């Protein structure tokens, strides 16, 4: 029974992982349809009610069904990608921390600089019964013990890694291990590693895309409390489309500069508010009638709010929306005030704020264009220009698809891992030793077979 239920559960997980993308686009349809239906509410009558202005009359049950379907699809879209990309993130982090433990001694000799959240958090997984769970190296603890045990204390290293130093020789003597069936009780209790699942969950909640999916699911749930909360899912097209991702990234690309120039605009408008509050108070009557005055600059807070809310948005500055200074002793002073406000705040600072984001968008697009232009002008591996190969017809294409293919390099690395150590050829053993010692000089750097044999070949 247990085998059947586990097989069915794993089949469901694999199905969700396979169809993670399809379910995301289905969620996109459901958000579109829900919002198209939402576009037909109206307020009716005090007690106000938001009711559909429907002629066919089927939209309301359709809307409820669509909302339920959206929540279910979002839950499926998180379970998928939890079965799909969380293992990759866990593997990458495990590899990083294992390499830091072995080559760097970042938890034996160095210790984190106390400001790295991930450096501090990764300490919990070190003393775990299953440190490498996605990472292939199951003897990282053994090699760390061999490298650092004798110098810094074998007992301390063993305690830090949560392992037994006297077990390895006994295992090499005899295995002394027995398998077991799964219908027994508390076996899952023995097998589960609460600390490892703790660390994994911390990493998952640190992951950005998981956070986005969780926010999507939370908004979908809130959509049942209020149907208008489904409007936030229309922002998913921004992530769906590249140019919209570029547009959103342009907002925060020059983040510090944009914040600082907004602060500068704030300071200069505050200075203008001070000047107006001290000298030009009588000109800030925003009342159409003389019966009662709505003075907007009788106090500094309201004057500053008025300046920001009105003068910045005004085409001609504050002078567009304040009184006329004709026939006044402060006429020239207030004319200078208005002209300088219009010049510094509207003409210059607002233009700079806009241009920061516009140029960030342009820079991101140009960076993408430059990336695409590269690998069409030079090879990814060797770096030789395309024209040198292009001297012969289809030369660059042949070089990049049959001589220096990065996919071919990846396949070669996989073939080296899968092949037995004893049966490696000379070249295979050479590459394998250099890869294990992390020596990347076997990659052709500025040279190729054709360049080496440029006169023997033709």
């Amino acid at each position: 029974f247990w085998k059947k239920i586990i097989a069915y559960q794993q089949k469901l997980l694999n199905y969700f992982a396979r169809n993670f993308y399809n379910m995301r686009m289905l969620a996109l349809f459901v958000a579109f349809a829900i919002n198209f239906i939402l576009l037909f509410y109206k307020v009716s009558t005090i007690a106000v009610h938001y009711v559909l202005e429907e002629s066919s009359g089927y939209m309301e049950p359709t809307l409820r069904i669509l909302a339920i379907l959206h929540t279910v699809i979002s839950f499926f879209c998180i379970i998928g990608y939890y079965c799909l990309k969380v293992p990759l993130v866990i593997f990458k982090r495990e590899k990083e921390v294992a390499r830091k433990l072995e080559f760097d001694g970042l938890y034996i000799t160095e210790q984190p600089s106390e400001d790295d959240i991930k450096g501090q958090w990764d300490r919990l997984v070190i003393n775990t019964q299953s440190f490498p769970n996605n990472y292939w190296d199951k003897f990282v603890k053994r090699k760390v013990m061999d490298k650092y045990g004798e110098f810094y204390g074998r007992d301390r290293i063993s305690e830090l890694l949560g392992m037994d130093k006297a077990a390895l020789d006994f295992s090499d003597a005899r295995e002394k291990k027995k398998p077991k069936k799964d219908s027994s009780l508390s076996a899952v209790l023995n097998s589960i590693d609460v600390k490892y699942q703790m660390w994994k969950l911390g990493v998952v909640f640190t992951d950005n895309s998981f956070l986005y999916l969780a926010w999507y699911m939370t908004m979908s749930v809130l959509g049942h409390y209020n149907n208008f909360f489904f409007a936030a899912h229309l922002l998913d097209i921004a992530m769906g489309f590249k140019t919209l991702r570029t547009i959103l990234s342009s907002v925060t690309h020059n983040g510090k500069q944009l914040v600082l120039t907004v602060g500068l605009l704030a300071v200069v408008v505050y200075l203008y508010t001070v000047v107006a509050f001290n000298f030009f108070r009588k000109f800030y009557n925003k009342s159409e009638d003389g019966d009662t005055p709505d003075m907007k600059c009788d106090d500094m807070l309201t004057c500053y709010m008025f300046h920001m809310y009105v003068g910045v948005r005004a085409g001609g500055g504050i002078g567009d929306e304040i009184e006329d200074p004709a026939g006044d002793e402060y006429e020239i002073y207030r004319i200078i005030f208005d002209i300088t406000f219009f010049f510094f705040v509207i003409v210059i600072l607002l233009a700079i704020i806009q241009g920061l984001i516009i140029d960030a968008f342009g820079e991101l697009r140009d960076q993408q264009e430059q990336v695409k232009e590269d690998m069409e002008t030079k090879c990814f591996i060797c770096g030789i220009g395309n024209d040198y190969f292009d001297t012969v017809p289809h030369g660059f294409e042949t070089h990049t698809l049959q001589e220096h293919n990065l996919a071919n390099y990846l396949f070669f690395l996989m073939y080296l891992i899968n092949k037995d150590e004893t049966e490696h050829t000379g070249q295979e053993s050479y590459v394998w030793k250099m890869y294990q010692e992390r020596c990347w000089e076997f990659f052709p750097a500025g040279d190729c077979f054709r360049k080496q044999y440029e006169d023997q070949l033709n």
């Binding site: 292009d390 017809p393 289809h394 660059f396």
Partner: protein
Amino acid sequence: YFEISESSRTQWEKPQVKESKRQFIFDVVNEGGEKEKMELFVNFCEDT
């Protein structure tokens, strides 16, 4: 070295051929790849 006919020169100087040549020049120089530039040029020769 070869012979060019005055009739061929006149037809080359006719305005429609000039428009075709302008369009082809823009196409090859702007977006036409240098890999098959000669192929495109021969095709343009046959069409002209």
